[PDB]
Write a structure and sequence with these properties.
The structure is a homodimer. Chain A is α/β, with parallel strands linked by helices. Chain A is 32% helix and 23% strand. The first copy, chain A, is built from 9 helices and 13 strands. Chain A has helices at 31-41, 56-67, 136-150, 171-179, 189-196, 201-206, 249-262, 270-286, 300-307, and strands spanning 6-9, 13-18, 23-29, 46-53, 71-78, 84-88, 98-100, 123-127, 153-157, 184-188, 215-219, 225-229, 232-236. Chain A has a 9-stranded mixed beta sheet. In chain A, α1 packs across α7 (249-262) and α7 (249-262) packs antiparallel against α8 (270-286). Chain A is globular and about 50 Å long. The two termini of chain A are 24 Å apart. At the A-B interface, β3 of A face β3 of B. Bound molecules: beta-D-fructofuranose (FRU) (2 copies) and sodium ion (2 copies). Chains A, B: InterPro entries: Carboh/pur_kinase_PfkB_CS, PfkB_Carbo_kinase, PfkB_dom, Ribo/fructo_kinase, Ribokinase-like. Chains A, B: ADP 2 binds at residues 186, 219, 221, 224, 241, 281. Chains A, B: Ca(2+) binds at residue 159. Chains A, B: ADP 1 binds at residues 93, 224, 241, 248-250, 281.
Chain lengths: 308, 308
């Protein structure tokens, strides 16, 4: 009867998304907060640690995460900096669809004292916005080092948003430094190419071979996901969906993947990994059926019915 | 056939205002931008100078102001800082209803080179957000000094929003320094008390007697406006309105007042001033009939029909 805690950390944000005509839906969001909810909706055991602003948006994000049964014991309210606020342009997708209105937001002031005690077998999942500026960058690296030290596991997803970085020249090396630390890494096909200075996927994975990463997942959008384990790769694909809102789809993917690994006897098992990537594909498809990153994050009942 | 230019300067902002249920209307706003439109709707000759962000909100504000026939020749796009973004809480009114999401926003980086050439007889109108931080504070003071030097006139409205100031201990003296420079000053009854460390209005005006201000207008909400000229005061009141949205009502007041003084043979004439405060009251009432600071700013046809 296995179920380990999965810690999520980084930016919780309010997503302003076009609706009425000149109206905005006010949607809960922020990539690591999206994953935290995703895991919880699947009956996972997720917990968030980090900083939001001491403002209504921050409180809306707090209440949102606890409403969703995500542990917020270690979610702090920064006394001066504002909660992240992003405007979405639906004509674009992924990184190119976001406009960040608060730089630096409260999360970029994550301090060492905000890290909770890690235990053996627990998971930690991280995105690159957490590495964008100080003190969050160095705080986040310290937390990764502490999780590995204790016998836990590290999940990383670049999830790139360049305009957040005050020194964008530092993105490549900083992101690749975290890749070098994780047990599990997930790229989009574009991010992998971009980050390894390569064209094609095969050359991408080449550039990181020396890292001995236990599991690299490269999502192919239409064609599913490529699953790279030591000395083997294969494509795992499921059903497709004409998407209504692609926002946070990649996070739902990460949600399913981490829910399944977190309840596994042994996450390194290949049958286990393949199954996990099958849940991850279903989640990512379903998540696109309603506006808002979190709105359509599936419970197990929905997911199984979609996969069958 | 008189009509002088009225320069407005400071913050242009996008006001997020509750609507649907968890929707936000996206409304043009920002106090000095509200006054600029107000003057133009009355067929005035208004012009805005200052900085917005090089982002969609900034461009939305630019297009808004030129659509409204306000001269934006001297409206600059800051290369790094974001456009001001404010969340409105309709349960409160005035200052207490605003949450500022961008601090410091692009306008707080107003530089000396952004000031346009002033001419004799022109007007300049200023709010305290323009004095909140540097370099805008010192830039704004320099522009006031330059307008007086050339033979033009200065309008000031505290229009207080405390959370914008990085050093809020500096608000009182900085605001009062600008009061000491203006030909025309308008307070709310609350701001006057607050700013002169007094209770009642009579004691308030006492504290500023030494300034020899040509015209002080104190708006009484329900009871109209108190008009203080050298050695005389009187209340000017008009019809009342159950307000739907009080947002920017004070700015519409300032709009009418400055439109009328700007087209006058001699703004110092008492009949002229009294008439101006009558237009100002009508504007402030009408402005509250629709959500959004700028939405219900009246044209002359509307205003006269309301006043008759
Ligand atoms: O992946 C989706 C999430 O990524 C962000 O752009 C930054 O965290 C959020 O605004 C959005 O919800
Ligand atoms: O007076 C109304 C205006 O004042 C502000 O709070 C700050 O400039 C704006 O958000 C609003 O439109
Ligand atoms: Na979605
Ligand atoms: Na209004």
């Amino acid at each position: 009867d296995s179920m380990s805690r999965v810690w999520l950390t980084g930016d919780a944000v309010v997503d302003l998304i076009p609706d009425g005509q000149q109206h905005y839906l006010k949607c809960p969001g922020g990539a690591p907060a999206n994953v935290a909810v995703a895991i919880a909706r699947l009956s996972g055991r997720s917990a968030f640690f980090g900083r939001v602003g001491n403002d209504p948006f921050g409180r809306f994000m707090q209440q949102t995460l606890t409403d969703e049964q995500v542990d917020c014991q270690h979610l702090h309210f920064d006394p001066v900096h504002r909660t992240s606020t992003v405007v979405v342009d639906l004509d674009e997708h992924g990184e190119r669809s976001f406009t960040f209105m608060v730089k630096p937001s409260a999360d970029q002031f994550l301090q060492l004292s905000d890290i909770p005690s890690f235990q053996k077998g627990e998971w930690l999942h991280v995105c690159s916005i957490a590495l964008a500026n100080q003190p969050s960058r160095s705080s986040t690296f310290a937390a990764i080092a502490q999780m590995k030290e204790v016998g836990g596991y590290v999940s990383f997803d670049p999830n790139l948003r360049e305009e957040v970085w005050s020194e964008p020249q530092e993105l490549q090396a900083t992101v690749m430094r975290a890749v070098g630390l994780a047990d599990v890494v997930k790229f989009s096909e574009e991010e992998l190419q971009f980050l390894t200075g390569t064209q094609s996927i095969e050359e991408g994975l080449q550039a990181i071979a020396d890292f001995q990463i236990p599991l690299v997942v490269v999502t192919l959008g239409a064609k599913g996901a490529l699953v790279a384990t030591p000395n083997s790769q294969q494509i795992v694909s499921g059903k497709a969906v004409k998407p209504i809102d692609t926002t946070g789809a990649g996070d739902a993917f990460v949600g399913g993947l981490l829910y399944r690994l977190s309840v596994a006897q042994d996450w390194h098992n290949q049958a286990t990994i393949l199954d996990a990537v099958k849940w991850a594909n279903g989640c990512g498809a379903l998540a696109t059926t309603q506006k808002g990153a979190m709105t359509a994050l599936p419970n197990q009942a929905a997911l199984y019915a979609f996969l069958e």
